[PDB]
Amino acid sequence: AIKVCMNALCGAASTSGEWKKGWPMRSGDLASLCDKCGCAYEQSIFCEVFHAKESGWRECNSCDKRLHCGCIASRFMMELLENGGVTCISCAKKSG
Amino acid sequence: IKVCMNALCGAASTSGEWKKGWPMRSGDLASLCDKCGCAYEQSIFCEVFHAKESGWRECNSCDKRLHCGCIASRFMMELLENGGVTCISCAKKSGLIS
Ligand SMILES: [Zn+2]
Ligand SMILES: [Zn+2]
Ligand SMILES: [Zn+2]
Ligand SMILES: [Zn+2]
Ligand SMILES: [Zn+2]
Ligand SMILES: [Zn+2]
């Protein structure tokens, strides 16, 4: 396959250094991210930097953290609550 | 006491049938009264009960609205590799049914 940045709103076909590790894709393999997108992802702010204008934002039920929902990039950064809404992964570790 | 598992309903009775709802965190299907369950079966549960919540998006290839970050709508869509979501019809048409 052609290797390209898996941020679909970037799609860069080249990068500085090696490709960076991204989020798990549906197949389980890790996404390839360019130097920019991968840098945001490493700092845990990919969606805040690159999905700021997309729909689907909610907030964590236990803290102020905004969470981009319906998004593969943030998919394992939150938990779906039985009574509605989401909590981020830190608060989820704190609540069992 | 058996109660409708839509927290904004909680009716203690039902007409005809308790209907099967969304898969809960444990994997079991929720028990819904006939109202809420009919809304669920027609894929409009979140449109009826969650219209004012955050988390709403649009299907990647059609106009269907999809309530994301919501356990009730979680088997009503598929997450795409491009960061968006697709409804179940578009998913069946694209080969993405998991
Ligand atoms: Zn990129
Ligand atoms: Zn995102
Ligand atoms: Zn939180
Ligand atoms: Zn009900
Ligand atoms: Zn909903
Ligand atoms: Zn669709």
- Token readout for A47 is 């969606």
The 3-state DSSP class for residue B72 equals helix
Q: Which of A75, A82, A86 sits opposite B24 (nearest CB)?
A: A82
Per CB-CB distance under 8 Å, the chain A contacts of B82 are 8
Can you give the resolution of this entry in Å? 2.2
Neighbours of A26 (CB within 10 A): 13
* CA A35 to ligand 1 centroid distance, Å: 7
The whole-angstrom separation of Cα A32 and Cα A25 is: 10
Nearest Cα neighbor of B22 from A84, A91, A60 is A84
Nearest Cα neighbor of A40 from A6, A63, A14 is A6
Q: Identify how the structure was determined.
A: X-ray
The whole-angstrom separation of Cα B22 and Cα B7 is: 13
**Nearest residue in A to B96, CA atom:** A26
Q: Which of A9, A55, A80 sits opposite B56 (nearest CB)?
A: A55
Ligand in nearest proximity to the CA of B65: 6
Cβ <8 Å between B55 and A56 = yes
